[PDB]
Amino acid sequence: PKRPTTLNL
Amino acid sequence: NNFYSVEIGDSTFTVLKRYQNLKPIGSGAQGIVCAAYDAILERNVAIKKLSRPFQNQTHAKRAYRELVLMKCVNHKNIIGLLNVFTPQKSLEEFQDVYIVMELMDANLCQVIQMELDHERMSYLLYQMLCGIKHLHSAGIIHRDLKPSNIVVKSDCTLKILDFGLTRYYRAPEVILGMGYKENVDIWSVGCIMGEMIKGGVLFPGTDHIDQWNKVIEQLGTPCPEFMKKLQPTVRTYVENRPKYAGYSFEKLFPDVLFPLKASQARDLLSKMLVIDASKRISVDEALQHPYINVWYDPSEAEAPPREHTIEEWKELIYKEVM
Ligand SMILES: CS(=O)(=O)CCCOc1cccc2c1cnn2-c1ccnc(N[C@H]2CC[C@H](O)CC2)n1
Q1: Kind and range of the H or E run holding B232
Q2: Is B172 in the pocket of ligand 1 (CB under 6 A)?
């Protein structure tokens, strides 16, 4: 699995 | 001449010219914090001006403690030191300490109640535990981890903001008069993970006694053995409450609530949210849990780690700044 690179603020 | 002054409410920030666009983003007993732009590194920073570091020996002791730990602790999941400075030119004039950190985008407060997928949930929790494990390796046990002192960026990276010592995330050890060990911090990780899943605060007590009651209402009255570990006067209150059986973790976190994985999350939760710390999961076991272990990298998860007068503290702090 590849690590998330985005996150909604 | 290397420095300029900006008025920040009733406070004057006198900072290196490299730091521009200062705006206050918070304050507390120990300092005032501004967002700024660093023209030399070409990035956004947080600038913390310490508040009354030399008023007394206890202030000075804490200020010295904070400076040293920030310098010595270096880990991607712990807020780092970019710079420290004083605008004063000698020990005799020395008054102000300014600590510069990377500027993060948000704390966890709103983020965790926005519904996250398993990947983001577990990845964020993995980083938290890596940070905590590194704190514990340096002999720091936080005891007050909450969404407000854990920070993130829009790229899904996470850092713990401070080194610790809103009661919703406080472990039973803390709530009551008890001893604590490393896994006191696991309770707080559990409360955060639960909140991520359910979309609201797990144990929202209206006061310190009420905090206890919301815990037992969901998890069940702790065993006699645990009651024995309590101080006499706290024991008289706690032991004489109605007896709650608790709910199973399937009832507390049913599939409905989630985005193999949900089963794995519940299992982890069932091990973190244990009232009796002697039966609660360790940081190492949490990092090894199937739900968390997917991200494992040893460089991240197994990284290597008195009495003075006021003027003596000033001197020790001045050396540290310099
Ligand atoms: C214990 S004390 O020294 O009295 C505490 C003083 C106040 O501490 C603070 C109040 C506010 C931010 C604070 C601090 C201390 N550090 N800090 C930081 C540090 C790095 N990034 C951010 N980004 C922020 C994250 C939050 C977001 O809403 C805006 C960008 N904030």
Answers
A1: helix B232-238
A2: no
Q: Residue A9: name the closest of B310, B119, B20, B116 by CA.
A: B116
Q: What is the CA radius of gyration of chain A?
A: 8
Angstrom distances, CA of residue B182 to CA of B151, B152, B277: 21, 23, 10
- Under an 8 A CB cutoff, do B156 and A1 touch? no
Give the closest residue (by CA) to ligand 1 atom 7: B27
Strands (E), chain B: 3-8, 11-16, 19-27, 31-38, 43-50, 83-85, 98-102, 106-107, 150-152, 158-160
In short, whether B33's Cβ falls inside 6 Å of ligand 1 is: yes
B185 given a catalytic annotation? no
In ligand 1, the atom with minimum distance to the C-alpha of B29 is: 4
Residue in the structure block whose two tokens are 């705006």: B23
User: Under CATH, what is the fold of the domain B3-105?
Assistant: Phosphorylase Kinase; domain 1 (3.30.200)
What is the CATH number that goes with domain B106-303? 1.10.510.10
Nearest CA to ligand 1 atom 27: B106
Q: In angstroms, rounded to a whole number, what is the distance separating the alpha carbons of residues B322 and B83?
A: 11
Looking at chain B, the domain(s) classified CATH 3.30.200.20 span 3-105
- Rounded Cα–Cα distance for residues B187 and B276 (Å): 10
CATH 1.10.510.10 domain span(s) along chain B: 106-303
Residue to mutate (ligand 1; options B25, B50, B100; most atoms within 8 A of CB)? B25
Helix (H, G, I), strand (E, B) or coil at B20: strand
B48 vs B287: CA distance, rounded Å: 32
| Given the residues B144, B185, B267, B276, the one annotated as active site | B144
Question: For residues B120 and B156, is the Cβ–Cβ distance under 8 A?
Answer: yes
CA of B167 to the centre of ligand 1 (A): 19
